[PDB]
Protein backbone atom coordinates (compact mmCIF):
# COMPACT_ATOMS: atom_id res chain seq x y z
CA UNK A 1 0.00 0.00 0.00
CA UNK A 2 1.12 3.56 -0.77
CA UNK A 3 0.12 6.25 1.72
CA UNK A 4 1.47 9.34 3.43
CA UNK A 5 2.28 8.76 7.09
CA UNK A 6 -0.13 10.96 9.05
CA UNK A 7 0.32 12.45 12.51
CA UNK A 8 -1.83 14.16 15.11
CA UNK A 9 -2.57 17.78 14.21
CA UNK A 10 0.39 20.06 14.82
CA UNK A 11 -0.70 23.67 14.97
CA UNK A 12 -2.41 26.45 16.89
CA UNK A 13 -6.17 26.40 17.49
CA UNK A 14 -7.99 29.69 17.98
CA UNK A 15 -9.21 30.57 21.47
CA UNK A 16 -12.97 31.07 21.65
CA UNK A 17 -13.72 34.51 23.06
CA UNK A 18 -16.45 37.11 23.40
CA UNK A 19 -16.92 39.63 20.60
CA UNK A 20 -15.78 43.11 21.74
CA UNK A 21 -18.25 45.97 21.54
CA UNK A 22 -17.46 48.55 18.87
CA UNK A 23 -17.06 52.26 19.68
CA UNK A 24 -20.45 53.03 18.13
CA UNK A 25 -21.98 50.30 20.31
CA UNK A 26 -20.40 51.73 23.46
CA UNK A 27 -21.47 55.26 22.53
CA UNK A 28 -25.06 54.12 21.93
CA UNK A 29 -25.10 52.38 25.31
CA UNK A 30 -23.79 55.52 27.00
CA UNK A 31 -26.39 57.65 25.21
CA UNK A 32 -29.20 55.34 26.35
CA UNK A 33 -27.96 55.29 29.94
CA UNK A 34 -27.62 59.08 30.02
CA UNK A 35 -31.10 59.59 28.56
CA UNK A 36 -32.54 57.18 31.13
CA UNK A 37 -30.70 59.05 33.89
CA UNK A 38 -32.05 62.45 32.79
CA UNK A 39 -34.39 63.85 35.46
CA UNK A 40 -37.12 66.26 34.27
CA UNK A 41 -38.40 69.21 36.31
CA UNK A 42 -41.43 67.65 38.00
CA UNK A 43 -42.49 66.17 41.33
CA UNK A 44 -43.24 62.58 42.30
CA UNK A 45 -46.53 60.65 42.33
CA UNK A 46 -49.28 63.25 41.72
CA UNK A 47 -48.41 66.22 43.92
CA UNK A 48 -49.45 69.56 42.44
CA UNK A 49 -49.30 73.25 43.27
CA UNK A 50 -51.76 73.34 46.16
CA UNK A 51 -50.34 70.16 47.72
CA UNK A 52 -46.77 71.47 47.54
CA UNK A 53 -47.59 75.03 48.64
CA UNK A 54 -48.33 74.03 52.24
CA UNK A 55 -44.85 72.58 52.73
CA UNK A 56 -41.70 74.65 53.08
CA UNK A 57 -39.41 75.16 50.06
CA UNK A 58 -36.83 72.74 51.48
CA UNK A 59 -39.38 69.96 51.92
CA UNK A 60 -40.85 70.74 48.49
CA UNK A 61 -37.34 70.29 47.09
CA UNK A 62 -37.18 66.97 48.93
CA UNK A 63 -40.40 66.01 47.14
CA UNK A 64 -39.05 67.14 43.74
CA UNK A 65 -37.94 64.44 41.28
CA UNK A 66 -34.27 65.36 41.75
CA UNK A 67 -34.35 63.76 45.20
CA UNK A 68 -36.66 60.99 43.95
CA UNK A 69 -35.51 57.42 43.47
CA UNK A 70 -35.29 55.53 40.19
CA UNK A 71 -38.58 53.75 40.93
CA UNK A 72 -40.36 57.06 41.50
CA UNK A 73 -38.94 58.53 38.29
CA UNK A 74 -39.99 55.39 36.38
CA UNK A 75 -43.50 55.63 37.82
CA UNK A 76 -43.67 59.31 36.84
CA UNK A 77 -42.69 58.49 33.26
CA UNK A 78 -45.24 55.68 33.06
CA UNK A 79 -47.88 58.06 34.42
CA UNK A 80 -47.03 60.57 31.69
CA UNK A 81 -47.31 57.93 28.97
CA UNK A 82 -50.63 56.79 30.44
CA UNK A 83 -51.99 60.34 30.46
CA UNK A 84 -50.92 60.57 26.82
CA UNK A 85 -52.49 57.31 25.61
CA UNK A 86 -55.37 56.70 28.05
CA UNK A 87 -59.07 56.25 27.34
CA UNK A 88 -60.06 58.27 30.42
CA UNK A 89 -58.33 59.69 33.52
CA UNK A 90 -57.88 56.36 35.37
CA UNK A 91 -57.66 54.02 32.35
CA UNK A 92 -54.53 51.92 32.94
CA UNK A 93 -55.61 48.55 31.50
CA UNK A 94 -56.62 49.49 27.98
CA UNK A 95 -54.26 47.75 25.53
CA UNK A 96 -52.70 51.05 24.40
CA UNK A 97 -51.81 52.04 27.97
CA UNK A 98 -50.63 48.49 28.65
CA UNK A 99 -48.34 48.70 25.62
CA UNK A 100 -46.91 52.01 26.84
CA UNK A 101 -46.32 50.71 30.37
CA UNK A 102 -44.75 47.47 29.13
CA UNK A 103 -42.41 49.45 26.88
CA UNK A 104 -41.39 51.69 29.79
CA UNK A 105 -40.79 48.68 32.04
CA UNK A 106 -38.72 46.98 29.34
CA UNK A 107 -36.56 50.09 28.96
CA UNK A 108 -36.10 50.41 32.73
CA UNK A 109 -35.05 46.77 33.04
CA UNK A 110 -32.66 47.14 30.10
CA UNK A 111 -30.96 50.08 31.83
CA UNK A 112 -30.82 48.13 35.09
CA UNK A 113 -29.22 45.19 33.28
CA UNK A 114 -26.66 47.45 31.60
CA UNK A 115 -25.68 48.50 35.11
CA UNK A 116 -25.97 45.15 36.96
CA UNK A 117 -24.94 42.95 34.04
CA UNK A 118 -24.63 40.09 36.57
CA UNK A 119 -28.35 40.13 37.52
CA UNK A 120 -29.47 37.04 35.62
CA UNK A 121 -33.10 36.83 36.78
CA UNK A 122 -33.86 40.21 35.22
CA UNK A 123 -32.94 38.88 31.77
CA UNK A 124 -35.64 36.23 32.24
CA UNK A 125 -38.06 38.91 33.43
CA UNK A 126 -37.18 40.96 30.34
CA UNK A 127 -37.90 38.02 28.03
CA UNK A 128 -41.26 37.43 29.73
CA UNK A 129 -42.18 41.11 29.37
CA UNK A 130 -41.14 41.14 25.71
CA UNK A 131 -43.51 38.23 25.09
CA UNK A 132 -46.31 39.99 26.96
CA UNK A 133 -45.80 43.19 24.95
CA UNK A 134 -45.82 41.16 21.74
CA UNK A 135 -49.18 39.63 22.68
CA UNK A 136 -50.61 43.03 23.62
CA UNK A 137 -49.54 44.47 20.27
CA UNK A 138 -51.04 41.50 18.43
CA UNK A 139 -54.36 41.97 20.24
CA UNK A 140 -54.49 45.73 19.71
CA UNK A 141 -53.65 45.40 16.01
CA UNK A 142 -56.82 43.41 15.36
CA UNK A 143 -58.98 45.29 17.87
CA UNK A 144 -58.22 48.85 16.68
CA UNK A 145 -55.86 49.34 13.74
CA UNK A 146 -55.86 53.15 13.63
CA UNK A 147 -55.18 53.40 17.37
CA UNK A 148 -52.50 50.71 17.01
CA UNK A 149 -50.73 52.82 14.38
CA UNK A 150 -51.11 55.96 16.49
CA UNK A 151 -49.69 54.26 19.59
CA UNK A 152 -46.73 52.85 17.67
CA UNK A 153 -46.07 56.28 16.14
CA UNK A 154 -46.21 58.07 19.49
CA UNK A 155 -44.03 55.47 21.22
CA UNK A 156 -41.51 55.51 18.33
CA UNK A 157 -41.61 51.71 18.18
CA UNK A 158 -41.78 49.54 15.08
CA UNK A 159 -45.37 49.11 13.90
CA UNK A 160 -45.40 45.37 13.31
CA UNK A 161 -48.42 44.02 11.43
CA UNK A 162 -50.18 40.70 12.05
CA UNK A 163 -52.23 40.42 8.85
CA UNK A 164 -50.88 36.90 8.21
CA UNK A 165 -49.20 34.41 10.55
CA UNK A 166 -45.52 34.94 11.25
CA UNK A 167 -42.81 32.80 9.65
CA UNK A 168 -40.56 30.03 10.93
CA UNK A 169 -37.50 31.60 9.25
CA UNK A 170 -35.52 33.76 11.68
CA UNK A 171 -34.41 35.92 8.74
CA UNK A 172 -38.08 36.87 8.23
CA UNK A 173 -39.56 36.47 11.72
CA UNK A 174 -40.83 39.30 13.89
CA UNK A 175 -38.38 40.56 16.53
CA UNK A 176 -39.88 41.88 19.78
CA UNK A 177 -36.27 42.73 20.66
CA UNK A 178 -35.90 44.75 17.46
CA UNK A 179 -39.06 46.61 18.42
CA UNK A 180 -38.22 49.97 20.02
CA UNK A 181 -35.06 49.84 17.92
CA UNK A 182 -35.04 53.60 17.40
CA UNK A 183 -33.94 54.10 21.01
CA UNK A 184 -31.28 51.37 20.88
CA UNK A 185 -29.55 50.73 17.56
CA UNK A 186 -27.71 47.73 19.03
CA UNK A 187 -31.06 45.90 19.38
CA UNK A 188 -31.70 45.65 15.65
CA UNK A 189 -29.95 42.74 13.94
CA UNK A 190 -26.93 40.43 13.95
CA UNK A 191 -25.02 38.26 11.49
CA UNK A 192 -25.38 34.50 11.33
CA UNK A 193 -22.78 32.77 13.50
CA UNK A 194 -23.51 29.01 13.44
CA UNK A 195 -21.56 26.34 11.55
CA UNK A 196 -20.46 27.85 8.20
CA UNK A 197 -21.33 31.36 9.42
CA UNK A 198 -19.08 31.30 12.49
CA UNK A 199 -16.53 34.15 12.63
CA UNK A 200 -13.08 33.25 11.39
CA UNK A 201 -9.97 33.37 13.55
CA UNK A 202 -7.88 36.53 13.91
CA UNK A 203 -4.38 37.09 15.29
CA UNK A 204 -4.39 39.77 17.97
CA UNK A 205 -1.63 42.28 18.71
CA UNK A 206 -0.40 40.12 21.60
CA UNK A 207 0.31 37.43 18.99
CA UNK A 208 -2.34 34.85 19.94
CA UNK A 209 -5.11 33.63 17.65
CA UNK A 210 -8.68 34.16 18.86
CA UNK A 211 -12.03 33.22 17.32
CA UNK A 212 -15.15 35.18 18.24
CA UNK A 213 -18.30 33.22 18.98
CA UNK A 214 -20.32 36.13 17.55
CA UNK A 215 -19.69 38.57 14.73
CA UNK A 216 -18.89 42.05 16.07
CA UNK A 217 -22.04 44.07 15.53
CA UNK A 218 -21.88 46.74 12.82
CA UNK A 219 -24.05 49.83 12.96
CA UNK A 220 -27.21 49.09 10.93
CA UNK A 221 -28.19 51.29 8.02
CA UNK A 222 -30.92 53.89 8.46
CA UNK A 223 -32.74 52.31 5.48
CA UNK A 224 -33.36 49.01 7.27
CA UNK A 225 -36.68 47.55 6.10
CA UNK A 226 -37.94 50.88 4.76
CA UNK A 227 -39.91 51.51 1.55
CA UNK A 228 -37.78 52.00 -1.56
CA UNK A 229 -38.30 53.59 -4.96
CA UNK A 230 -38.18 51.08 -7.83
CA UNK A 231 -37.51 51.68 -11.49
CA UNK A 232 -39.84 50.11 -14.08
CA UNK A 233 -38.66 46.64 -15.06
CA UNK A 234 -39.79 43.31 -16.49
CA UNK A 235 -37.45 40.52 -15.38
CA UNK A 236 -37.19 37.46 -13.14
CA UNK A 237 -37.55 39.65 -10.05
CA UNK A 238 -40.62 41.36 -11.58
CA UNK A 239 -42.17 38.85 -14.01
CA UNK A 240 -45.28 41.05 -14.41
CA UNK A 241 -43.92 44.59 -14.02
CA UNK A 242 -43.81 46.94 -11.05
CA UNK A 243 -46.78 48.45 -9.23
CA UNK A 244 -47.04 52.22 -9.05
CA UNK A 245 -46.78 51.90 -5.27
CA UNK A 246 -43.41 50.19 -5.69
CA UNK A 247 -42.35 52.86 -8.19
CA UNK A 248 -43.32 55.67 -5.80
CA UNK A 249 -41.99 53.96 -2.67
CA UNK A 250 -45.34 54.30 -0.88
CA UNK A 251 -45.89 50.58 -0.25
CA UNK A 252 -46.25 49.00 3.19
CA UNK A 253 -43.94 46.52 4.92
CA UNK A 254 -45.73 44.34 7.48
CA UNK A 255 -42.57 43.17 9.26
CA UNK A 256 -40.23 46.17 9.69
CA UNK A 257 -38.29 44.13 12.28
CA UNK A 258 -37.30 41.37 9.85
CA UNK A 259 -33.60 40.62 10.25
CA UNK A 260 -33.08 39.96 6.55
CA UNK A 261 -31.16 37.30 4.66
CA UNK A 262 -27.84 36.60 6.35
CA UNK A 263 -28.89 38.34 9.58
CA UNK A 264 -30.27 37.11 12.90
CA UNK A 265 -32.11 39.31 15.41
CA UNK A 266 -30.08 41.10 18.04
CA UNK A 267 -29.38 39.22 21.30
CA UNK A 268 -31.61 39.60 24.33
CA UNK A 269 -28.77 41.17 26.32
CA UNK A 270 -25.11 41.68 25.47
CA UNK B 1 -66.67 19.37 23.21
CA UNK B 2 -64.02 19.80 25.87
CA UNK B 3 -66.81 20.60 28.33
CA UNK B 4 -68.67 17.40 27.41
CA UNK B 5 -65.55 15.25 27.72
CA UNK B 6 -65.13 16.88 31.14
CA UNK B 7 -68.75 16.27 32.17
CA UNK B 8 -68.16 12.57 31.54
CA UNK B 9 -66.17 12.52 34.79
CA UNK B 10 -68.94 14.23 36.76
CA UNK B 11 -71.47 11.76 35.36
CA UNK B 12 -69.39 8.68 36.25
CA UNK B 13 -69.39 9.37 40.02
CA UNK B 14 -70.46 6.64 42.45
CA UNK B 15 -71.77 6.83 46.01
CA UNK B 16 -72.90 10.41 45.34
CA UNK B 17 -76.35 11.98 45.29
CA UNK B 18 -75.29 14.82 43.00
CA UNK B 19 -72.13 16.06 41.28
CA UNK B 20 -71.12 19.27 39.52
CA UNK B 21 -69.78 19.71 35.99
CA UNK B 22 -68.77 22.64 33.77
CA UNK B 23 -71.54 24.57 32.04
CA UNK B 24 -72.10 24.67 28.28
CA UNK B 25 -75.11 24.67 25.97
CA UNK B 26 -73.93 21.36 24.51
CA UNK B 27 -73.80 19.96 28.04
CA UNK B 28 -77.35 21.20 28.65
CA UNK B 29 -78.59 19.49 25.49
CA UNK B 30 -76.86 16.20 26.33
CA UNK B 31 -78.38 16.40 29.81
CA UNK B 32 -81.80 16.93 28.25
CA UNK B 33 -81.30 13.77 26.20
CA UNK B 34 -80.16 11.84 29.28
CA UNK B 35 -83.16 12.93 31.35
CA UNK B 36 -85.55 12.07 28.51
CA UNK B 37 -83.88 8.64 28.45
CA UNK B 38 -84.30 8.41 32.24
CA UNK B 39 -80.62 8.06 33.17
CA UNK B 40 -80.42 10.97 35.64
CA UNK B 41 -82.88 12.14 38.26
CA UNK B 42 -82.34 15.72 37.14
CA UNK B 43 -80.00 18.66 36.85
CA UNK B 44 -79.77 22.35 37.72
CA UNK B 45 -78.03 25.21 35.92
CA UNK B 46 -76.06 27.52 38.24
CA UNK B 47 -73.87 30.04 36.42
CA UNK B 48 -70.52 28.50 35.52
CA UNK B 49 -71.54 25.08 36.89
CA UNK B 50 -74.29 22.50 36.41
CA UNK B 51 -75.36 20.31 39.34
CA UNK B 52 -76.47 16.86 38.15
CA UNK B 53 -78.71 14.95 40.56
CA UNK B 54 -77.88 11.33 39.74
CA UNK B 55 -80.17 8.29 39.79
CA UNK B 56 -79.47 4.94 41.46
CA UNK B 57 -81.13 1.52 41.50
CA UNK B 58 -80.49 -1.26 44.03
CA UNK B 59 -77.35 0.50 45.22
CA UNK B 60 -75.56 0.66 41.88
CA UNK B 61 -75.94 3.75 39.66
CA UNK B 62 -78.05 3.76 36.52
CA UNK B 63 -75.11 5.04 34.45
CA UNK B 64 -72.68 2.12 34.48
CA UNK B 65 -70.32 3.23 31.70
CA UNK B 66 -69.52 6.14 29.39
CA UNK B 67 -67.45 5.70 26.22
CA UNK B 68 -66.32 8.88 24.49
CA UNK B 69 -66.29 8.72 20.68
CA UNK B 70 -65.90 12.25 19.28
CA UNK B 71 -63.10 14.17 20.99
CA UNK B 72 -62.23 17.83 20.33
CA UNK B 73 -59.08 16.61 18.54
CA UNK B 74 -60.96 14.15 16.31
CA UNK B 75 -64.50 14.17 14.92
CA UNK B 76 -66.34 10.92 14.22
CA UNK B 77 -69.14 10.87 11.64
CA UNK B 78 -71.22 7.98 10.34
CA UNK B 79 -73.62 7.30 7.51
CA UNK B 80 -76.94 5.69 8.49
CA UNK B 81 -75.91 2.21 7.35
CA UNK B 82 -72.63 2.48 9.27
CA UNK B 83 -74.42 3.69 12.41
CA UNK B 84 -76.75 0.70 12.18
CA UNK B 85 -73.83 -1.74 12.08
CA UNK B 86 -71.91 0.03 14.84
CA UNK B 87 -74.91 0.11 17.20
CA UNK B 88 -76.05 -3.43 16.27
CA UNK B 89 -77.45 -5.60 19.07
CA UNK B 90 -76.94 -3.15 21.92
CA UNK B 91 -79.32 -1.55 24.41
CA UNK B 92 -76.94 1.31 25.17
CA UNK B 93 -77.46 4.95 24.27
CA UNK B 94 -75.16 6.40 21.59
CA UNK B 95 -75.51 10.19 21.58
CA UNK B 96 -75.54 11.68 18.09
CA UNK B 97 -75.30 15.31 16.99
CA UNK B 98 -76.99 16.14 13.69
CA UNK B 99 -78.48 19.07 11.81
CA UNK B 100 -81.72 18.21 13.64
CA UNK B 101 -80.26 18.53 17.16
CA UNK B 102 -78.68 16.26 19.74
CA UNK B 103 -80.66 13.01 19.57
CA UNK B 104 -80.27 9.28 20.14
CA UNK B 105 -78.84 6.82 17.64
CA UNK B 106 -82.31 5.30 17.28
CA UNK B 107 -83.81 8.64 16.22
CA UNK B 108 -80.85 9.10 13.87
CA UNK B 109 -81.39 5.63 12.38
CA UNK B 110 -85.09 6.23 11.80
CA UNK B 111 -84.31 9.61 10.20
CA UNK B 112 -81.52 8.20 8.01
CA UNK B 113 -79.39 11.33 8.50
CA UNK B 114 -75.63 11.61 8.82
CA UNK B 115 -74.51 12.36 12.36
CA UNK B 116 -71.55 12.86 14.66
CA UNK B 117 -71.11 10.24 17.39
CA UNK B 118 -70.34 11.93 20.73
CA UNK B 119 -70.85 9.48 23.60
CA UNK B 120 -72.05 5.96 24.36
CA UNK B 121 -73.89 5.40 27.67
CA UNK B 122 -74.26 1.88 29.10
CA UNK B 123 -73.03 0.49 25.78
CA UNK B 124 -71.12 -2.32 27.47
CA UNK B 125 -68.00 -3.12 25.46
CA UNK B 126 -68.83 -1.84 21.97
CA UNK B 127 -66.57 0.69 20.26
CA UNK B 128 -64.51 1.02 17.10
CA UNK B 129 -62.33 4.13 17.54
CA UNK C 1 -50.45 10.52 -4.98
CA UNK C 2 -52.97 8.93 -2.61
CA UNK C 3 -55.63 6.52 -3.90
CA UNK C 4 -58.67 5.63 -1.78
CA UNK C 5 -60.29 2.21 -2.10
CA UNK C 6 -63.88 1.70 -3.20
CA UNK C 7 -65.24 0.87 0.25
CA UNK C 8 -63.19 3.67 1.80
CA UNK C 9 -64.79 6.20 -0.54
CA UNK C 10 -68.22 5.41 0.97
CA UNK C 11 -67.29 6.20 4.58
CA UNK C 12 -68.64 9.30 6.31
CA UNK C 13 -65.20 10.72 7.06
CA UNK C 14 -64.02 10.46 3.46
CA UNK C 15 -67.30 11.84 2.13
CA UNK C 16 -67.28 14.79 4.53
CA UNK C 17 -63.67 15.72 3.76
CA UNK C 18 -64.44 15.47 0.03
CA UNK C 19 -67.46 17.73 0.56
CA UNK C 20 -65.30 20.24 2.43
CA UNK C 21 -62.68 20.23 -0.32
CA UNK C 22 -65.11 20.52 -3.24
CA UNK C 23 -66.82 23.71 -4.38
CA UNK C 24 -68.73 24.65 -7.54
CA UNK C 25 -66.40 25.02 -10.53
CA UNK C 26 -63.57 23.62 -8.36
CA UNK C 27 -63.20 26.99 -6.63
CA UNK C 28 -61.08 27.41 -3.51
CA UNK C 29 -60.86 29.81 -0.57
CA UNK C 30 -57.69 31.24 0.93
CA UNK C 31 -55.93 34.37 2.12
CA UNK C 32 -53.39 36.62 0.43
CA UNK C 33 -49.73 36.03 1.27
CA UNK C 34 -48.19 38.16 -1.51
CA UNK C 35 -49.39 41.33 -3.23
CA UNK C 36 -46.19 42.95 -4.52
CA UNK C 37 -46.68 42.05 -8.19
CA UNK C 38 -49.30 43.81 -10.34
CA UNK C 39 -52.57 42.00 -11.07
CA UNK C 40 -51.32 38.98 -9.12
CA UNK C 41 -51.70 37.46 -5.66
CA UNK C 42 -50.33 34.41 -3.89
CA UNK C 43 -53.10 32.72 -1.89
CA UNK C 44 -52.78 30.11 0.86
CA UNK C 45 -55.74 27.72 0.84
CA UNK C 46 -56.76 25.22 3.52
CA UNK C 47 -56.89 21.64 2.24
CA UNK C 48 -57.86 18.54 4.21
CA UNK C 49 -57.03 14.84 3.92
CA UNK C 50 -58.69 11.95 5.75
CA UNK C 51 -56.32 9.31 7.11
CA UNK C 52 -58.09 5.96 7.29
CA UNK C 53 -55.66 4.32 9.71
CA UNK C 54 -56.23 6.85 12.49
CA UNK C 55 -59.76 7.87 11.42
CA UNK C 56 -59.12 11.61 11.58
CA UNK C 57 -58.54 14.55 9.26
CA UNK C 58 -55.51 16.84 9.15
CA UNK C 59 -55.17 20.18 7.37
CA UNK C 60 -52.39 21.38 5.06
CA UNK C 61 -51.88 24.51 2.98
CA UNK C 62 -51.98 24.96 -0.79
CA UNK C 63 -50.29 28.11 -2.13
CA UNK C 64 -51.11 29.22 -5.68
CA UNK C 65 -50.86 32.36 -7.81
CA UNK C 66 -54.07 33.92 -9.13
CA UNK C 67 -54.96 36.81 -11.43
CA UNK C 68 -56.52 39.98 -10.00
CA UNK C 69 -57.64 42.24 -12.85
CA UNK C 70 -58.17 45.17 -10.49
CA UNK C 71 -56.13 45.96 -7.35
CA UNK C 72 -58.49 45.02 -4.52
CA UNK C 73 -56.83 42.01 -2.83
CA UNK C 74 -54.15 43.13 -0.36
CA UNK C 75 -52.06 41.09 2.03
CA UNK C 76 -54.15 39.30 4.64
CA UNK C 77 -57.49 39.37 2.79
CA UNK C 78 -59.66 36.26 2.48
CA UNK C 79 -60.57 35.57 -1.15
CA UNK C 80 -62.21 32.97 -3.37
CA UNK C 81 -60.39 31.87 -6.53
CA UNK C 82 -61.19 29.71 -9.54
CA UNK C 83 -58.85 27.71 -11.80
CA UNK C 84 -58.23 28.75 -15.40
CA UNK C 85 -57.05 25.65 -17.25
CA UNK C 86 -54.04 27.58 -18.57
CA UNK C 87 -51.02 29.38 -17.11
CA UNK C 88 -50.90 33.14 -17.70
CA UNK C 89 -47.19 33.90 -17.74
CA UNK C 90 -44.89 31.75 -15.60
CA UNK C 91 -46.93 31.79 -12.36
CA UNK C 92 -50.61 32.71 -12.47
CA UNK C 93 -53.00 29.76 -12.71
CA UNK C 94 -56.21 30.88 -10.94
CA UNK C 95 -58.49 33.92 -11.21
CA UNK C 96 -59.93 35.94 -8.33
CA UNK C 97 -63.67 35.37 -8.00
CA UNK C 98 -64.62 37.43 -4.94
CA UNK C 99 -63.31 38.96 -1.71
CA UNK C 100 -64.75 37.44 1.47
CA UNK C 101 -62.91 39.33 4.25
CA UNK C 102 -60.85 42.51 3.88
CA UNK C 103 -58.14 43.43 6.36
CA UNK C 104 -58.48 47.12 7.30
CA UNK C 105 -56.37 49.47 5.18
CA UNK C 106 -55.07 52.93 6.07
Amino acid sequence: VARLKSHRYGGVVALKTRAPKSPWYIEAEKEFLNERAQVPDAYIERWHGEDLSKLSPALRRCLHLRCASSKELHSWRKLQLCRLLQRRPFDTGSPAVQLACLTEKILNVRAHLLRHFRDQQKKKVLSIWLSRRHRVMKYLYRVDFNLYKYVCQQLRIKCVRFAIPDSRDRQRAISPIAVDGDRCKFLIRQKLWKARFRPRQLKQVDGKVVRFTRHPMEQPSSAWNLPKEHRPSLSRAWPYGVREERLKGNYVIQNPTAAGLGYCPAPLFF
Amino acid sequence: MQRACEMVVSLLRVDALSQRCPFHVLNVQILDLLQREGLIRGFKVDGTKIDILLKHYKGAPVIRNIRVVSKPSRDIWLTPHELKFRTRFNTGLWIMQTSCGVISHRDCLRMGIGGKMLMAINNGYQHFC
Amino acid sequence: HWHYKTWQRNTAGYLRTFMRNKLPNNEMIGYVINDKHPKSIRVACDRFMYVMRYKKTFRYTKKVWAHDEESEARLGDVVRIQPLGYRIGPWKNYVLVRVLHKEPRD
Partner: peptide
Protein backbone atom coordinates in the same frame (compact mmCIF):
# COMPACT_ATOMS: atom_id res chain seq x y z
CA UNK D 1 -65.20 23.02 16.03
CA UNK D 2 -62.01 21.16 15.19
CA UNK D 3 -59.71 22.88 12.67
CA UNK D 4 -58.96 26.38 13.99
CA UNK D 5 -56.40 27.28 11.34
CA UNK D 6 -55.71 30.91 10.43
CA UNK D 7 -58.40 31.01 7.74
CA UNK D 8 -60.89 29.16 9.94
CA UNK D 9 -60.31 31.56 12.83
CA UNK D 10 -60.64 34.60 10.56
CA UNK D 11 -63.94 33.31 9.15
CA UNK D 12 -65.22 32.27 12.61
CA UNK D 13 -65.73 35.63 14.30
CA UNK D 14 -69.18 37.10 14.93
CA UNK D 15 -67.89 40.36 16.43
CA UNK D 16 -64.72 42.24 17.30
CA UNK D 17 -65.16 41.59 21.04
CA UNK D 18 -66.38 38.43 22.77
CA UNK D 19 -67.96 40.13 25.78
Amino acid sequence: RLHNSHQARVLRRRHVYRD
